[PDB]
Amino acid sequence: AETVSFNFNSFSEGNPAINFQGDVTVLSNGNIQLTNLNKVNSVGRVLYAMPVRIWSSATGNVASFLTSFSFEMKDIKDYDPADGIIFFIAPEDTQIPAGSIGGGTLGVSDTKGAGHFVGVEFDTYSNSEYNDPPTDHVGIDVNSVDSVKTVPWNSVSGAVVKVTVIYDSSTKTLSVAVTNDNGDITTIAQVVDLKAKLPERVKFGFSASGSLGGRQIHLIRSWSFTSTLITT
Amino acid sequence: AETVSFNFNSFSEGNPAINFQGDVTVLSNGNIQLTNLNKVNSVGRVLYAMPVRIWSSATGNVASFLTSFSFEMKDIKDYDPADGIIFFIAPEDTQIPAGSIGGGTLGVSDTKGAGHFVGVEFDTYSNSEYNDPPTDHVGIDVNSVDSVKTVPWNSVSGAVVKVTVIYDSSTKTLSVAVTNDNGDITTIAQVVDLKAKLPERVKFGFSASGSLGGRQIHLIRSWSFTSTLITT
Amino acid sequence: AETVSFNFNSFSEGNPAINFQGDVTVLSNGNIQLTNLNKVNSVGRVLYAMPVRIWSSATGNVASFLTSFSFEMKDIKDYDPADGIIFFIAPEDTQIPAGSIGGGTLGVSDTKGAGHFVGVEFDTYSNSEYNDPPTDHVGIDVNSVDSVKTVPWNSVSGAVVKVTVIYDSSTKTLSVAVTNDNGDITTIAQVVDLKAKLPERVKFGFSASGSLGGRQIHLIRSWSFTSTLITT
Amino acid sequence: AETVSFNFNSFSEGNPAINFQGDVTVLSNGNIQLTNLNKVNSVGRVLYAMPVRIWSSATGNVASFLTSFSFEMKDIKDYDPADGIIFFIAPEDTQIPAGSIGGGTLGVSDTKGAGHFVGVEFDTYSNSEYNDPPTDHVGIDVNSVDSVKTVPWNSVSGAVVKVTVIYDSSTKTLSVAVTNDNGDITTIAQVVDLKAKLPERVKFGFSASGSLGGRQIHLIRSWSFTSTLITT
Ligand SMILES: OC[C@H]1O[C@H](O[C@@H]2[C@@H](O)[C@@H](O)O[C@H](CO)[C@@H]2O)[C@H](O)[C@@H](O)[C@H]1O
Ligand SMILES: OC[C@H]1O[C@H](O[C@@H]2[C@@H](O)[C@H](O)O[C@H](CO)[C@@H]2O)[C@H](O)[C@@H](O)[C@H]1O
Ligand SMILES: OC[C@H]1O[C@H](O[C@@H]2[C@@H](O)[C@H](O)O[C@H](CO)[C@@H]2O)[C@H](O)[C@@H](O)[C@H]1O
Ligand SMILES: OC[C@H]1O[C@H](O[C@@H]2[C@@H](O)[C@H](O)O[C@H](CO)[C@@H]2O)[C@H](O)[C@@H](O)[C@H]1O
Ligand SMILES: [Ca+2]
Ligand SMILES: [Ca+2]
Ligand SMILES: [Ca+2]
Ligand SMILES: [Ca+2]
Ligand SMILES: [Mn+2]
Ligand SMILES: [Mn+2]
Ligand SMILES: [Mn+2]
Ligand SMILES: [Mn+2]
């Protein structure tokens, strides 16, 4: 079978295994900081440089994958803790939307909240224009930040969060399990047909954004990934 | 929220947090060995001693959980490498079925393969009496070892296998990610209504079995777990 | 290593991880209330349901533990604010003393003040029959409410109190740090050989009590714990 | 009672409340990075700017204190993960030793390993010249990096570590509890007469160092502190 597998205990710019877009930067501690605290409508995204083949036009087979990552969001004076981080999957040529306003678009959608991507968002601000729930939340997005589904969550400033994601191609189910500083686990799952929503080859990554008054530290600390596609 | 969480990097015979049943034994290296290589129809099970409320009768709420564990199965002469291991959930009064014939029952069912439990099996022998697929496989079991669903897999003697399981209460989806020796991942997911199949309080654990001619080393090396039930 | 770690941010009566004894009750806010304000000689205790092995007869090793908890004691008309709360450790079979008179016994000892337990008391009433110092105090008890050692302290009605306790097995030192509302910390430490005073298997918990004329609200708000026993 | 209390959830290169010495820097994420990964024999230290009065020349009384802090150490290509971090107490005029060679001195002592300070070290390299134990370890130091006492420990690269320290003045005992990545807690306690070893007013802080071939990321993420001196 065809398998893609990698693991980042730390990140470093100048490492070809990753694409850097927007205001992203890598701190001396190896952490990826997606947004620039000193910019309006800041937007930063990171992508595994190598495109991953998630499905086949020859066989119709779709890959299954298991990926885990840890991130950290932390408040700062004197802006609102916004806007959040989104782990996403998109066409290999994906780029930050032209004239991106950042903010609630999480750096992957247009002003209306649309784009070509599937992702899991960790939202820390309620944008009514995208029908966000009243509190912080984890959401499953399919070509829109107006989540197909969300679950109440709480972004704890300064806390390291661990996420586990399983995509079962057979049932087309994307399951997500997220850590919480208080010890609880939060989960959300959703049937998502990657073959119908995304091209055969895609890029996986992370994006985060802020606005004029909405800014916070967005860090990606580690990331492991393994996908397997049955070939014939 | 009511949460039960723990993390076992190794095991010990004296830990009251673990219920030992049957032929289970603890090796000097901290590994748990489930079956006795010298006994016929051997059955050994290990359960977390703390009952877990997977659902509430008062609120109707159902918990979600994340758990990971690693195990190892190793051949031995001159017996057939059987029968396998099963990660299961059962009522808190659960015990090895009286008069258990072990073998293909995996220590959780009767001769007919029926029982009161939900589990994920790592089956290394094809029992036609339970409609097993022809090769080694991972299966989702609901009150029977005649799996509700299975996926082809391969048990490599002496290999360490990493497993990640996510149960999303909202969708009632049980997702399993199995990371093989060769690096490939294998997944299987199934909608299982724990609230409809099990009581409010249950126990989680592992069971393994053998027959007269089928015997192998069944080891549980580690186990982390977190389940959360929304209360109040 | 053998480790036991849990973290209660709040409580619930149906949570199997907690043994309730006596007049204990759970408030809608998740707080545990140990005594019954309307009962003479009230006694209420709460225990972590699972036995904790604090030392091994096979290795002679004793565990170290770090535990933090917050409680609150508030006066009421027209009773004297008594008698206090005690964080204790005792045999796994520990029950409220038969015919307990509550009051100065704190629900862990008999009339003479003797019992089988080790604990840190937050005493708010001076019982001369137990040689209490003249004012409120924190004390280290070993099989008796006639403290092996005490330190002047002040129980502020309605004040939330935080406590951190460290037990270093190697030095057998039980160190306590109490953070009052006014910000000051109060500490007391005492060498206590848990191995010599307690059985290998014990249970940790809290107890509070009152008399006919001595009653007050005793609340346990949170409790985190981690013990580690070196296994060799 | 004279109480000194503070809390840092993040730091900033501009808050005078902290003295920055040597190569220390403050990252955009609010973390303090003690050493410069690009410098030979790098040394960085941070001190709470306000001197703390730990004892009275009038009463002879000594203060008790409770402090908690979190840190992180991560490896880097292609140097040995060294040398570690030390939480220390020293005269208010304390400065990095003249002509410091960094390395095993941890930035608080001369070449022989001598200095004027009391501290808890999180050592990640075995210096025979200072009688270090063979593995990583937590040590209690008194005017020397040739620890008065040590306990085996393990520094996990990329892991956030929480530490809690209690100093009980009456028993002159310094107790430490370290919360590791795998869940276990590591403790060490030692009687240290602060009044006999340190001046009336001191500064508390953190220090880390590296050498030519020994370098790693030394981060301080947070730090809470409370000390109380009884005045009669
Ligand atoms: O506060 C941060 C947020 O900023 C923007 O949201 C609104 C803004 O449109 C306007 O309504 O004013 C309020 C309060 O001043 C908010 O700032 C972004 O649209 C959000 O994404 C978020 O960053
Ligand atoms: O061979 C291991 C195997 O033993 C038992 O079943 C087999 C059966 O499938 C085969 O047809 O015949 C042999 C010899 O009579 C055994 O009966 C167990 O039931 C099975 O689980 C496995 O352990
Ligand atoms: O007042 C509350 C107090 O009641 C009981 O003791 C007192 C005793 O200290 C006092 O001297 O006399 C009264 C009247 O007889 C009570 O005996 C409890 O023993 C004590 O713990 C406290 O609850
Ligand atoms: O390798 C990091 C390590 O360097 C130094 O330790 C010894 C050094 O004293 C000795 O002379 O040579 C060996 C190998 O070249 C090591 O470098 C530092 O003293 C030590 O603190 C640590 O930083
Ligand atoms: Ca939003
Ligand atoms: Ca079978
Ligand atoms: Ca008393
Ligand atoms: Ca050293
Ligand atoms: Mn959203
Ligand atoms: Mn089967
Ligand atoms: Mn007392
Ligand atoms: Mn050392």
UniProtKB/Swiss-Prot annotation, chains A, B, C, D:
Domain of life of the source: Eukaryota
Coiled-coil ranges from the UniProt annotation: none
Alphabetical UniProt keywords: Calcium, Lectin, Manganese, Metal-binding, Signal
Signal is among the record's keywords: yes
Binding site for Mn(2+): E121, D123, D132, H137
Gene Ontology molecular function terms on file: carbohydrate binding; metal ion binding
Outcome after substituting K162I: In minor form
Outcome reported for the amino acid change (mutating E92V): In minor form
Subunit annotation: Homotetramer.
Record's function text: D-galactose specific lectin.
UniProt family annotation: Belongs to the leguminous lectin family.
Further comment found in the protein's record: Binds one manganese (or another transition metal) ion and one calcium ion. The metal ions are essential for the saccharide-binding and cell-agglutinating activities.
Descriptive protein name: Galactose-binding lectin
Lineage: Eukaryota, Viridiplantae, Streptophyta, Embryophyta, Tracheophyta
Part of the intact protein present: 24 to 255 of 273
